[PDB]
Amino acid sequence: LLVPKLTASVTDGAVGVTVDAPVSVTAADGVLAAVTMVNDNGRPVAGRLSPDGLRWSTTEQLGYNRRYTLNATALGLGGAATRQLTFQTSSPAHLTMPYVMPGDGEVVGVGEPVAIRFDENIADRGAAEKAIKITTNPPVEGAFYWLNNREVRWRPEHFWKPGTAVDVAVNTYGVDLGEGMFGEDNVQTHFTIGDEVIATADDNTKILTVRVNGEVVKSMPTSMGKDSTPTANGIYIVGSRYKHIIMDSSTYGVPVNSPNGYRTDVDWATQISYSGVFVHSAPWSVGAQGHTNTSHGCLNVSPSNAQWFYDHVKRGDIVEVVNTVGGTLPGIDGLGDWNIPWDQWRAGNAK
Ligand SMILES: CC(C)OC(=O)CSC1=C(C(=O)O)N2C(=O)[C@H]([C@@H](C)O)[C@H]2[C@H]1C
Ligand SMILES: N[C@@H](CCC(=O)O)C(=O)O
């Protein structure tokens, strides 16, 4: 008759044990009679034994900077075996928390990237990417691209198909993200792609045309950026919307008392770039809308058309600007992701 055998998922005396996974113990030639795991202060860790008695596993989050002692006994027809193991878990120098957009359960437009923003600079971008699990249904190829040292984006080659489910699991707890920085916790969000809404602003006509699943539903006269402060061409992702907002140029790097500075209260404002471009109500320029460009870059429309835009456009819908005297919106603006060529985006920038 054989003596039972105990096998744990950790080794006695180990250090740097990662807490991204549970601790387990298994028995062979016998069953587990008792397993306890305690903190250095003596507090027991929650765990559960399988019904057949062969496997025990922790069932609660294990802590950073802990010394745990595991005690296990197995019993079989051939006798008994007992082991005691002590190990230390990872000791981070820093913790970073991820924040994910869009919100859980949200319905968003066909331009919405997955966005994961860490509250600290990430030294090992590849480790962060490998810790993020994206599920799509219907499945579609996509790729990660970093906008700065803290925020990574994931998107497909082309705009999302309406009706797609997107699941984002940021599994960074216990993961070394470089230079001793570990994830503060896990985060999990899910969103769904709604109707295709693409609004095109053509400087040749000074009309902003809104198309919903390919059909024109609204044609709004607009006044875009004057020649000295023009609106950049390119693809813009719709962000936040405001019934009213004080637009402060200092938010976008321009002092208010400077030649192109401003501080202006506007109604019905939909943000389309981090650089400060909005679609918004402009009662002062209704005469120029559809005729001449007068703004600092914003898409001026009538009060009723700005309210319509606020009511009918959602986060992740698309505004495309064409034929202006500006350049192209930067790919790393924050809402300019689609201006990066797919070959470049797909290659990534983790290194
Ligand atoms: C994931 C992408 C697609 O969008 C979002 O994270 C939404 S956060 C929000 C927007 C916005 O209109 O989207 N921002 C600004 O302007 C702020 C910039 C200047 O820091 C941020 C903040 C107020
Ligand atoms: N708004 C600018 C300065 C504007 C001003 O000239 O008063 C800033 O504080 O960055």
Residue numbers in the entry: 57 to 407
Report text from the authors:
The L,D-transpeptidase class in M.tb is comprised of at least four substructural domains including two immunoglobulin-like domains (IgD1 and IgD2), a YkuD domain, and a C-terminal subdomain (CTSD). The YkuD domain has a highly conserved motif HXX14-17[S/T]HGChN containing three residues analogous to the catalytic triad of cysteine proteases: a cysteine, a histidine and a third residue (Cysteine 354, Histidine 336, and Serine 337 in LdtMt2) to catalyse the transpeptidation reaction. Based on our structural, biophysical, and biochemical data, we identify a new PG disaccharide moiety-binding pocket (named as S-pocket) at a distance of 21 Å from the catalytic site in LdtMt2.
Electron densities were observed in both the S-pocket and the outer cavity of catalytic pocket in the LdtMt2. Consistent with our docking results of T203 drug with LdtMt2, the 2-oxoethyl side-chain of R3 group from T203 could be modelled into the electron density of the S-pocket. In the S-pocket of LdtMt2, the 2-oxoethyl sidechain of T203 drug is stabilized through hydrophobic interactions with the A171, M157, P169, and L390 residues. No electron density was observed for the pyrrolidine ring of T203, while its carboxylic group fitted into an electron density making electrostatic interactions with backbone nitrogen of S296 and the guanidium side chain of R371. In the catalytic site, the T203 carbapenem interacts with the outer cavity at a covalent distance from the SΥ atom of C354. The amino N4 of the pyrrolidine ring makes electrostatic interactions with NE2 of H336 and the backbone amide nitrogen of H352. We observed that binding of the T203 drug introduces unique allosteric alterations in the salt bridge and hydrogen bond interactions spanning the entire distance from the S-pocket to the YkuD flap of the catalytic site.
